[PDB]
Structures are given as structure tokens and as C-alpha cells.
Amino acid sequence: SDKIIHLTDDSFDEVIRNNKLILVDFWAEWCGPCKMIAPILDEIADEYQGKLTVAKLNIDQNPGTAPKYGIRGIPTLLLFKNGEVAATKVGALSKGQLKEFLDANLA
């Protein structure tokens, strides 16, 4: 939970550039599915500590980033490798499904 960076429009670009592998959760307090999958991510940031950074962008509070990265709706997860977008998972999902998506995109 406190392993999860909260990005702002302002902070975004620097952060993703700044650490190798990072997973961003585009979310909002009104989006139920985003609320739903949030504790999954909590666990992921623990379970993947040291291999993968996990971050949230609240879009109500950071209106500009989503269009910038072609986020058409939430939830939507972005995996960046080396400061660049690598894979993208749209819609709600189970830990299992998320874990696969992660594994199948690291090494």
C-alpha cells in the first residue's frame, strides 16, 4: 500500500523514465472495478518487491496523462520497461490473470 507510488501529471514522465520496470494503474474513486482490483495490486507490490514498481494515477486529479498514453477507459494497466510502454491490460481482472500478464512480460 505504501509501496505504491502515486504519480501526478507533473511527476509521471520523470518517474516512469526513472525506474526500469513499473506498472501503472489508471483509476478513480468512482470506478468500482478499479476499487475492486486495488487490493490485488497491494499484494503485487509486496509480492513483486524489488523486481517491479507499482504505481497509481488518479485521473480525476490528473486529467492529462490518460489521453497522453492512449488510455480510453478505466481500469487500464500499463507496463513500462526502460521508460517506454511495453504491454497493456484493459478492464477488471483476477490476481491470477494479472500475475500471468506480469510474468509473461518480464523474462
Curated annotation (Swiss-Prot):
Q: Gene3D superfamilies, from UniProt?
A: Glutaredoxin
Q: Which PROSITE patterns match?
A: THIOREDOXIN_1, THIOREDOXIN_2
Query: What's any one GO cellular component for it?
Result: cytosol
Alphabetical list of CDD domains matching this protein: TRX_family (cd02947)
- Where do the Thioredoxin domain residues begin and end? 1-107
What InterPro entries does UniProt report for this protein, alphabetically? Thioredoxin, Thioredoxin-like_sf, Thioredoxin_CS, Thioredoxin_domain
State the Gene Ontology terms under molecular function: DNA polymerase processivity factor activity; protein-disulfide reductase activity
Instruction: Give GO terms for biological process.
Output: cell redox homeostasis
Tell me the keywords, alphabetical order: Acetylation, Disulfide bond, Electron transport, Host-virus interaction, Redox-active center, Transport
Instruction: Indicate where the modification N6-acetyllysine is found in the sequence.
Output: 68
Please tell me whether the keyword Disulfide bond is annotated for this protein.
yes
Catalytic site: 31 (nucleophile), 34 (nucleophile)
Residue pairs linked by disulfide bridges in the UniProt entry: 31-34
Q: Would I find Transport among this entry's keywords?
A: yes
Where does the source fall among the domains of life? Bacteria
Q: Which chain positions carry the site (Contributes to redox potential value)?
A: 32-33
Protein role: Participates in various redox reactions through the reversible oxidation of its active center dithiol to a disulfide and catalyzes dithiol-disulfide exchange reactions.
Query: What family name appears in the similarity comment?
Result: Belongs to the thioredoxin family.
Question: What is annotated about its quaternary structure and interactions?
Answer: Monomer. Interacts with bacteriophage T3 DNA polymerase.
What is the recorded name of this protein? Thioredoxin 1
Say which species the protein is native to: Escherichia coli (strain K12)
